[PDB]
Amino acid sequence: QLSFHRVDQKEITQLSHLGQGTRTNVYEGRLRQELRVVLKVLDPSHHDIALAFYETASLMSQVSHTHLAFVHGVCVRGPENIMVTEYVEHGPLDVWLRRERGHVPMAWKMVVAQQLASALSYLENKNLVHGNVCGRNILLARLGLAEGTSPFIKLSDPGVGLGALSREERVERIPWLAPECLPLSTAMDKWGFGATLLEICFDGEAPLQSRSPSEKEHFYQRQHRLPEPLATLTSQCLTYEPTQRPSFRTILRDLT
Ligand SMILES: CNc1cc(Nc2cccnc2OC)nc2c(C(=O)NC3CC3)cnn12
């Protein structure tokens, strides 16, 4: 039941390269009033990667939430598949926190956590999986560092569906990757959320990120506990047994 808007190649302009996603490159672009958008260009890929990419477009095209980024549609530009998504002003949260490290107030992080939990509450209610909750996929729409302002985030489309990704890619996503996904339930997004809470507390330094693939795989193999930052809450989320992780109803009540 794949449902999304087809964008004709004539309607898009590609501008500067912004970075890499999982098997994609992200560019600032225009969508014809033109609109500032981002263009996520899928690398030369087999049908099964492209299917997981279009399944993501389809999912995002059928949900709405103020803390979820918008998908404009998919464009086929010659051999390239291109997701056309919301340009979010201040870009990804992980990069932003690294640049602002040591002066991001805790009250600011708590607002961002709440907004993310409100997005994942909505997906939970809809029984839909995001599958890639991390600081890179949290886009900052409003800075909220000035006196009397608050931040505002948009969770990006999860990109190529996690189900299609390689073992090495799943390892690269530790510790955001729920441990049951290393070998397709909303439970995995509770683990991703806890790991993203740690990443935020630590000003965009995720636990275990500087470790090798075998070291990351070893940590999950031994069911080692992730560090404490929110601490009761991250612990509850970062439980190896998926059925033990709290609902977003509980997580959201706890955060307010
Ligand atoms: C400022 N606007 C902006 C910058 C950007 N940069 C970016 C992209 C990829 C990798 N690294 C990046 O930054 C260091 N990405 C985005 C998105 C977006 O959906 N990105 C993909 C990663 C989810 C939306 N707006 N936007």
Side-chain angles (χ1 to χ4, degrees), residues 2-31 34-183 185-221 223-256:
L2 257 46
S3 181
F4 55 89
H5 171 67
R6 282 183 227 95
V7 170
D8 198 76
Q9 65 182 58
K10 289 165 186 194
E11 292 171 306
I12 59 155
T13 306
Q14 187 177 301
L15 299 183
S16 291
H17 185 249
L18 295 173
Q20 297 185 199
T22 302
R23 307 213 201 184
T24 65
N25 286 273
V26 178
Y27 298 86
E28 180 186 356
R30 294 294 185 271
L31 177 62
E34 303 196 293
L35 207 76
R36 176 172 300 95
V37 296
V38 289
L39 301 181
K40 299 198 189 184
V41 178
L42 188 66
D43 288 341
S45 298
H46 190 277
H47 168 268
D48 291 25
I49 298 306
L51 178 48
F53 194 63
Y54 278 77
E55 284 169 337
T56 284
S58 176
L59 162 76
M60 291 310 281
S61 292
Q62 293 187 76
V63 299
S64 318
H65 196 265
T66 196
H67 293 305
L68 295 178
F70 185 69
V71 168
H72 293 278
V74 178
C75 177
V76 181
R77 187 175 75 194
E80 284 172 327
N81 295 293
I82 305 171
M83 211 177 293
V84 180
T85 76
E86 183 172 3
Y87 186 101
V88 181
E89 188 165 357
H90 307 277
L93 188 61
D94 71 314
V95 170
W96 187 85
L97 281 171
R98 285 191 304 258
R99 205 170 51 178
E100 309 285 359
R101 62 176 168 274
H103 55 262
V104 180
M106 193 50 72
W108 188 101
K109 297 174 168 171
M110 286 303 92
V111 170
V112 163
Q114 281 180 59
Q115 297 183 346
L116 178 59
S118 76
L120 297 175
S121 174
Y122 169 73
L123 291 183
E124 191 191 75
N125 291 161
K126 299 282 287 177
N127 190 41
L128 297 176
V129 179
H130 181 279
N132 199 15
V133 177
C134 63
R136 174 56 54 80
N137 278 334
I138 301 163
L139 300 162
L140 191 63
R142 188 174 60 205
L143 268 186
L145 290 180
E147 175 61 24
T149 69
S150 54
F152 206 103
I153 62 104
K154 306 276 176 182
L155 179 60
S156 167
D157 78 88
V160 177
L162 172 68
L165 298 192
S166 73
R167 200 178 164 77
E168 295 71 39
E169 282 163 323
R170 298 200 299 280
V171 171
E172 288 176 344
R173 289 198 185 178
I174 295 168
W176 302 277
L177 181 94
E180 70 274 12
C181 302
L182 177 60
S185 156
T186 54
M188 75 170 81
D189 285 341
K190 297 159 169 72
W191 178 288
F193 178 77
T196 304
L197 250 42
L198 292 181
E199 173 187 21
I200 295 176
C201 292
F202 300 152
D203 282 352
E205 292 296 331
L208 305 188
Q209 263 314 272
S210 72
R211 301 198 190 181
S212 73
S214 32
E215 284 170 348
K216 293 183 157 191
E217 204 172 332
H218 189 210
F219 191 101
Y220 275 24
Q221 201 215 334
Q223 301 201 302
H224 210 59
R225 297 320 306 275
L226 272 167
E228 295 203 75
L230 280 194
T232 319
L233 184 63
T234 57
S235 266
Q236 276 205 322
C237 290
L238 290 177
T239 294
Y240 282 77
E241 175 53 44
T243 59
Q244 291 288 293
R245 299 175 197 144
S247 70
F248 275 106
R249 178 191 167 178
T250 299
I251 293 166
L252 199 54
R253 171 181 68 70
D254 293 338
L255 282 169
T256 65

